[PDB]
Amino acid sequence: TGYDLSNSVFSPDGRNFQVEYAVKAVENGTTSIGIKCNDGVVFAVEKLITSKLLVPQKNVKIQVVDRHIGCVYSGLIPDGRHLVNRGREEAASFKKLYKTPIPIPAFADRLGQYVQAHTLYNSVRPFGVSTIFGGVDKNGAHLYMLEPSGSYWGYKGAATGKGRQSAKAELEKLVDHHPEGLSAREAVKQAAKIIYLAHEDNKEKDFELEISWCSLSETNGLHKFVKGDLLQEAIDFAQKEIN
Amino acid sequence: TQQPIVTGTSVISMKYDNGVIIAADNLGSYGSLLRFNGVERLIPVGDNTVVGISGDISDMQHIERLLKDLVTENAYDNPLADAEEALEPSYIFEYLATVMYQRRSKMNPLWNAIIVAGVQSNGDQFLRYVNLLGVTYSSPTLATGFGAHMANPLLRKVVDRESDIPKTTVQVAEEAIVNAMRVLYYRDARSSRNFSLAIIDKNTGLTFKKNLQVENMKWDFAKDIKGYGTQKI
């Protein structure tokens, strides 16, 4: 055998074991989710409080690309940052040439082609992150989820990390119970709940909630972090549902 | 090595007790042809800075995009982007001042004279000049092009030195600026009647005024002027 020792090598199955091994690193990471809503998207993430010494609200994991796209990821955090740095270069060179801010499907493929490129050679390692991202453009709201292989799709709801199955199950219920659509302010509250429900799969260390959102009405189409009263309102909503 | 094509004339500005005023007409000249009349040559960066640009308009539009991209880049991984780590006038200027000098040193300048007017986070007035050569200076009054020759003399009658700044109110300062814009309309052949004016105050913030016009002009005496010397009729 030895087919798993080198990246970009096909096993006899037709699989790239190094990419599947990168997925294990993603599965090991903290939970992160994405919820598509009426006129925008909502992102949320589980931040494990390793120690009391961690400064609250000052280890931000969700990243903005351009002014209208939000990105969150699970797995190897530095790999996720590298991907976002690239996204920002891609978005900047798009706006530079075409004037208009980069559309979300266009942006999604820019990351996709870059991550896919890291499964083509043995001199690079695949990305150890699944990236949930999206935003609002001229065609409306879009939510995406990108994996180590370079595979990505459009999603109504997306989840990844150690509590992905718990989150997915809870996401599927929202899609069934809200066929006409979920509002932006509702999605923020739901996002909080789902992170709290998905925290049951990582319950040794207690955690810190972090939420962001793009919405054509609420945030004027721009990416903003959910802070202060709106954040505490969402936390209380989640606290009430677990009990 | 460039030559400017579509050009914008004077930018004028001055400090007053609580902030700064900056103004520039809405004309995009094409040599002697007064080609474009809806040009905005004052560009606000955030809610605390206004960059006034004269000279080549294509290079002005490039600078606009850099400032626009600077705001975006500052927001990245910055929870305090709208607070303590927001863009200051001094940051924005130094960036431009760097770019202008780097381009002149590569013998490929941005053919512009720029005045960055704003108010710092500590409440201090910021007003500084930079041009295509990368030459920088600061003064209670600053002006580009014809404004340097005609506006500055008038504005310096109000604020002649640093100690006159606390004595000058926003009403007086704005009146001098508007007066100067009229004088430039009389005498600058590449100026227009329509202009924009911006006030950055440490209390009331950024007030951006559009579609102003030069008015209260003296033209009546022209009827009495006949010929060029001896002619009586």
From Swiss-Prot, chain A:
Present with 12000 molecules/cell in log phase SD medium. The keyword NADP does not apply. GO terms for molecular function: mRNA binding. The keyword Lyase does not apply. The gene is PRE10. GO terms for cellular component: nucleus; proteasome complex; proteasome core complex, alpha-subunit complex; proteasome storage granule. This is Probable proteasome subunit alpha type-7. The proteasome degrades poly-ubiquitinated proteins in the cytoplasm and in the nucleus. It is essential for the regulated turnover of proteins and for the removal of misfolded proteins. The proteasome is a multicatalytic proteinase complex that is characterized by its ability to cleave peptides with Arg, Phe, Tyr, Leu, and Glu adjacent to the leaving group at neutral or slightly basic pH. It has an ATP-dependent proteolytic activity. It comes from the Eukaryota. Belongs to the peptidase T1A family. GO terms for biological process: proteasomal ubiquitin-independent protein catabolic process; proteasome-mediated ubiquitin-dependent protein catabolic process.
UniProtKB/Swiss-Prot annotation, chain B:
Non-catalytic component of the proteasome which degrades poly-ubiquitinated proteins in the cytoplasm and in the nucleus. It is essential for the regulated turnover of proteins and for the removal of misfolded proteins. The proteasome is a multicatalytic proteinase complex that is characterized by its ability to cleave peptides with Arg, Phe, Tyr, Leu, and Glu adjacent to the leaving group at neutral or slightly basic pH. It has an ATP-dependent proteolytic activity. PRE3 and PRE4 are necessary for the peptidyl-glutamyl-peptide-hydrolyzing activity. It is found in: Cytoplasm; Nucleus. Belongs to the peptidase T1B family. The keyword ATP-binding does not apply. It comes from Saccharomyces cerevisiae (strain ATCC 204508 / S288c) (Baker's yeast). PANTHER family: METALLOPROTEASE TLDD, PROTEASOME SUBUNIT BETA. SUPFAM superfamilies: N-terminal nucleophile aminohydrolases (Ntn hydrolases). The 26S proteasome consists of a 20S proteasome core and two 19S regulatory subunits. The 20S proteasome core is composed of 28 subunits that are arranged in four stacked rings, resulting in a barrel-shaped structure. The two end rings are each formed by seven alpha subunits, and the two central rings are each formed by seven beta subunits. The catalytic chamber with the active sites is on the inside of the barrel. Interacts with CIC1. This is Proteasome subunit beta type-7. Present with 16900 molecules/cell in log phase SD medium. The keyword Aminoacyl-tRNA synthetase does not apply. GO terms for cellular component: cytosol; nucleus; proteasome complex; proteasome core complex, beta-subunit complex; proteasome storage granule. Keywords: Cytoplasm, Nucleus, Proteasome. Pfam families: Proteasome. GO terms for biological process: proteasomal ubiquitin-independent protein catabolic process; proteasome assembly; proteasome-mediated ubiquitin-dependent protein catabolic process. InterPro entries: Ntn_hydrolases_N, Proteasome_beta4, Proteasome_bsu_CS, Proteasome_sua/b, Proteasome_suB-type.
